[PDB]
């Protein structure tokens, strides 16, 4: 037995109750138990002995931290795949000005989330913006790239410039003759 | 007398010099608690704004207590001097006071505690520590270890770095146990890490054409000619700075008296101006 735990809030409680049977279903599929405490608000995941997968407990700790950060529940169950990995980028201490932080976070949001959808299509990820933090996912290369994108849009380089660079990246990566040089003349 | 003194304090209540003259007369007549009362009433009745006057009474009280008082009252008035005045300033003054009074060991402890507290942003405190060790305590190796601690404590901003290292090098050039060779060491490393700073080159030329060998007070013309040559040979000289350096070389060879080298400075100036 080896246990991980954290604490979820009282607006996420109803989410976790009406949303729990699939979480415990996939985790019984991975042979690990989990229950929901309501009088305290902790999700407790307990590795059994029949756990044939050793990575499943670390994936379950990632599960419980995404459900504590109110990330969507079977996206968090999609973390149970191989190349998926979560990451959080705090930006409230990167931007020292209050209103400039708010304006830069909604500049990140863009008009109707079209820039968000373009970023997640271009990097094959999922983006959630939990105010001071941002929840991201995907393949590890995509994780590095979206961490780069969020630090540039907090340093006030515009996401339309970044989608320009990322589409030029995409095309110059899919053509094979240009396989290895320094392509900064194109960006 | 006390009556004339009260008359002049009625006339100029701000005048801290006549205040310390009054408590000085009372330390002559040796009622030291009365002198304490005079300096206290000074801090109360001197016009409030005058910081230099109040700190003069403060320094006088510190001198009074390190002369005739005890360790407990020197620490207590140290504390109230901090809470009423500038902390780093009163630490620097008590440092200089212990320097004059010769209590060099407790002086050293206060030097340690000020370089811990206000060593984050003050370079002059590390300068005064190195000044103490190149003076009386005779610890130049400990001083350059303090220089390592100094480039640890300070930021790598240009004032901090490029002004603590030349200040230390100048202190080596001005103190004979500080070894002008260590001064040339620091300045050689400085011109290595920044070969574009002609003001630093000029200051090296200044301290080398000045009294560098403090043990017998000359300059050294061989390495002076060498560094003038290298300064002519480094890249980046604007023609005004080049003319100024050629003038400095020419005037140094005029103080030397070597007219052959003076002619060589003029020939070097014309063959450099040909460009």
């Amino acid at each position: 037995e080896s246990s991980f735990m954290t604490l979820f809030p009282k607006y996420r409680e109803r989410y976790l109750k009406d949303c729990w049977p699939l979480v415990t279903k996939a985790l019984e599929k991975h042979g690990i138990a989990a229950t929901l405490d309501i009088v305290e608000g902790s999700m407790t995941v307990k590795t059994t002995r029949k756990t044939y997968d050793p990575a499943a407990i670390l994936k379950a700790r990632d599960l419980i931290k995404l459900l504590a950060r109110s990330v969507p529940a079977p996206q968090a169950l999609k973390i149970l795949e191989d190349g998926m990995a979560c990451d959080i980028i705090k930006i409230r201490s990167m931007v020292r000005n209050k209103e400039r932080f708010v304006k830069r976070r909604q500049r990140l949001l863009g008009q109707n989330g079209t820039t968000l959808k373009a970023l997640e299509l271009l990097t094959q990820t999922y983006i959630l913006v939990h105010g001071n933090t941002v929840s991201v996912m995907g393949g590890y290369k995509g994780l590095k790239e979206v961490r780069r994108v969020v630090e540039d849009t907090m340093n006030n380089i515009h996401p339309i410039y970044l989608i320009k660079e990322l589409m030029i990246k995409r095309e110059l990566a899919k053509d094979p003759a240009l396989a290895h040089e320094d392509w900064s003349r194109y960006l | 007398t006390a009556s004339d003194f009260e008359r002049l304090l009625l006339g100029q209540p701000d005048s801290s010099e006549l205040w310390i003259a009054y408590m000085a007369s009372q330390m002559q007549v040796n009622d030291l608690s009365s002198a304490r009362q005079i300096a206290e009433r000074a801090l109360k009745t001197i016009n409030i704004r005058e910081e230099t006057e109040k700190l003069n009474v403060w320094i006088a009280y510190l001198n009074l207590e390190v002369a005739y008082g005890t360790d407990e009252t020197v620490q207590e008035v140290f504390k109230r001097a901090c809470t009423y005045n500038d902390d780093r300033e009163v630490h620097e003054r008590l440092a200089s006071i212990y320097i004059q009074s010769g209590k060099y060991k407790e002086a050293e402890d206060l030097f340690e505690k000020i370089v811990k507290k206000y060593g984050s942003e003050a370079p002059h405190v590390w300068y005064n520590y190195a000044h103490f060790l190149h003076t009386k305590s005779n610890k130049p190796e400990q001083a350059r270890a303090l220089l390592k601690r100094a480039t640890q404590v300070l930021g790598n901003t240009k004032d901090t770095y490029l002004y603590l290292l030349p200040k230390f090098a100048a202190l080596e050039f001005r103190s004979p146990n500080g070894d002008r060779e260590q001064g040339r060491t620091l300045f050689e490393k400085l011109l290595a890490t920044y070969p574009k700073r002609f003001d630093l080159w000029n200051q090296l030329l200044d301290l080398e054409t000045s009294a560098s060998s403090v043990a017998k007070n000359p300059a050294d013309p061989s390495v002076i000619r060498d560094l003038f040559e290298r300064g002519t040979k480094v890249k980046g000289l604007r023609p005004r700075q080049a003319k100024a350096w050629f003038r400095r070389w020419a005037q140094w060879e005029e103080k030397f008296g070597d007219a052959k080298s003076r002619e060589k400075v003029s020939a070097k100036a014309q063959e450099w101006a040909r460009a």
Partner: protein, 49 residues
């Protein structure tokens, strides 16, 4: 008196400001209460005091 309490607070704020002169928000408090001193001193000098 009211003006007496105001000049009491005035000299107290002045004492703290000279205790640390780099306290500029409290310096602003000082210039505000000094403006109040000026106003009420004139308005109670008009009556005869």
């Amino acid at each position: 008196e009211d003006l007496y309490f105001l000049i009491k607070k005035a000299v107290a704020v002045r004492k703290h400001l000279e205790r640390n002169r780099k306290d500029k928000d409290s310096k602003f408090r000082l210039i505000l209460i000094e403006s109040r001193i000026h106003r009420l001193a004139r308005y109670y000098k008009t009556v005869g005091v």
